[PDB]
Amino acid sequence: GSNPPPPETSNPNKPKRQTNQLQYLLRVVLKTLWKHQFAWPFQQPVDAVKLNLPDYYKIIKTPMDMGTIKKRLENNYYWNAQECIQDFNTMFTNCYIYNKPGDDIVLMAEALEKLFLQKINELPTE
Numbered sequence: 001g002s003n004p005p006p007p008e009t010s011n012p013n014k015p016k017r018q019t020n021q022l023q024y025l026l027r028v029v030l031k032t033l034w035k036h037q038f039a040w041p042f043q044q045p046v047d048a049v050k051l052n053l054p055d056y057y058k059i060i061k062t063p064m065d066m067g068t069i070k071k072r073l074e075n076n077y078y079w080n081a082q083e084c085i086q087d088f089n090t091m092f093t094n095c096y097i098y099n100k101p102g103d104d105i106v107l108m109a110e111a112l113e114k115l116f117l118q119k120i121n122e123l124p125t126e
């Protein structure tokens, strides 16, 4: 039972907002990554129990996944786009820290991150 609670996707006191940038993040960035062939392992938290990776949450203390990001965006959890961008970067970084280069998961993260960076370059409010 080595899985933590997942990251919060709502919070009573944290102020909530919808900006054009946050709409772009849900409707274009998340949408393109979510439907990518390599999205699926990132669509929910890492299941250290199911994967038999009992040390995952010993090593990764700031977990993040796209399921979480998607719910945060749908819930207007974020105040600004930078918060969301930060979550995507945390997701990628965690994957690169925990796994070794040439692991399939790392190659999947690299392909998603390329696409992420391309979509982030067109972020509106321009």
Ligand SMILES: Cc1noc(C)c1-c1ccc2c(c1)O[C@H](CC1CC1)C(=O)N2
Binding pocket: 041, 042, 046, 047, 051, 053, 094, 095, 098, 099, 104, 105, 108
């Ligand atoms: C994402 C992620 N970051 O570190 C690890 C470990 C994962 C991870 C998440 C889900 C799965 C996983 C790795 O292994 C396989 C998929 C990977 C082999 C590609 C699986 O079925 N689910």
